[PDB]
């Protein structure tokens, strides 16, 4: 007899953060480390900034959130802690994903965080992860914490290391599927703000943007956070704009296709000289340079304009590859 296995079990990770991946959410310093003196605690306070940390899951298998979501376990651990897998009692027991909203905060801070992100439930695009709900639950210490509830997206991110860079035609075809989602966001006065390979999921059917945490209104300055090597240089002066999103498209294509120099763990600004890929595909190199121009006024004016030029580049790359 062949066994009946629960396919959810293979989708979940062991709910322990390895010591090499433990950092303070506030100051970024390593925390919870074992030394030649003492063993590293899974929860405590950062010795440098005094912020509380916890690498323990805050939702356990069998927990019911807001009488709707049955927690099954952990999918991954990120900047905002654990990402949980749950089954939605209102939508046929469909597996869904829960993620925290803030690293720390009292009841009022949690309630404010939920309310400010509620508009994401209105974002409707086939290439953007769907947000279903904002729910409250108590953490491992008994204090209420807020969670975003989202669609479970299959596959893996587009993040590629130095040895597995995408062929140019493949990368362009991927971004051509992403650019309409950005055009859709820009059409409703929103900026995605966090485009990078890690935030693009490749499924058996399509590409999907995840991590809507940075999604903000155009020219707002409430959220200026970003990754050195992806974020537009002028974000402090202008706040998120269509121009800053175009810059991230350029950096995303470069990070997927080029062996970009890295310094202190981040990609360096601009594009490397005499790069074999950019010498091979000239129109592609020209498009990337325009997209990452330090002057935002020199970049593609709209995502639709960038898509039009990018389609032209794809035809040229495909012709050259013959
Ligand atoms: N909606 C989702 N569906 C499926 N897996 C998800 C979803 N959101 C996040 N994940 C998983 O968690 C990982 C990190 O997600 P993300 O939101 O980027 O967290 P962080 O920015 O904190 O690292 C993803 O690469 C994916 O494996
Ligand atoms: Mg992310
Ligand atoms: Mg985020
Ligand atoms: Zn700290």
Contact between residue 79 and residue 115 where contact means Cβ atoms under 8 Å apart: no
88 lines ligand 1 (CB under 6 A): no
Active site residue 194: yes
To test the ligand 1 pocket, which listed residue (15, 23, 76, 200) has its Cβ within 8 A of the most ligand atoms? 76
- The experimental technique used to determine this model is X-ray
d(CA 66, CA 101): 16
Domains of the chain by start residue, with CATH: 9-16+55-151 (3.30.200.20), 156-320 (1.10.510.10)
Which of 34, 52, 51 has the alpha carbon at shortest distance from 43? 52
C-alpha span between 108 and 21 (Å, rounded):
30
Residue nearest to atom 23 of ligand 1 (CA): 78
Considering only CA atoms, which residue is closest to atom 18 of ligand 1? 211
């Amino acid at each position: 007899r062949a066994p009946d296995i629960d396919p959810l079990e293979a989708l979940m990770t062991n709910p322990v953060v390895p010591e090499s991946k433990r950092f303070c959410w506030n100051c970024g310093r390593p925390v919870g480390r074992s030394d030649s003196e003492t063993k590293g605690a899974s929860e405590g306070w950062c010795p440098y900034c005094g912020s509380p940390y916890s690498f323990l899951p805050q939702l356990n298998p069998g927990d019911i959130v807001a009488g709707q979501y049955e927690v099954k376990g952990c999918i991954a651990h990120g900047g905002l802690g654990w990402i949980y897998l749950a089954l939605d009692r209102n939508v046929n027991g469909r597996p869904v994903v829960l993620k925290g909203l803030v690293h720390s905060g009292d009841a009022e801070a949690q309630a404010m965080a939920m309310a400010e992100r509620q508009f994401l439930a209105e974002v409707v695009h086939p290439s953007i992860v769907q947000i279903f709900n904002f729910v409250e639950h108590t953490d491992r210490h008994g204090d209420p914490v807020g969670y975003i509830v989202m669609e479970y997206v299959g596959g893996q991110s587009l993040k590629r290391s130095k040895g597995q860079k995408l062929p140019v035609a493949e990368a362009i075809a991927y971004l051509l599927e992403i650019l309409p989602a950005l055009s859709y966001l820009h059409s409703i006065g929103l900026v995605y703000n966090d485009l990078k390979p890690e935030n693009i999921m490749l499924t058996e059917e399509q590409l999907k943007l995840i991590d809507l945490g940075a999604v903000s209104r155009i020219n707002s300055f409430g959220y200026l956070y970003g990754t050195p090597g992806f974020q537009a240089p002028e974000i402090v002066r202008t706040g998120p704009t269509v121009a800053t999103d175009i810059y991230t498209v350029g950096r995303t294509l470069a990070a997927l296709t080029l062996d970009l120099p890295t310094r202190n763990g981040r990609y360096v600004d601009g594009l490397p000289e005499d790069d074999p890929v950019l010498k091979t595909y000239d129109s592609y190199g020209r498009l990337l340079r325009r997209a990452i121009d330090p002057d935002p006024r020199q970049r593609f004016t709209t995502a639709e304009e960038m898509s039009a030029q990018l389609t032209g580049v794809l035809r040229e790359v495909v012709a050259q590859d013959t």
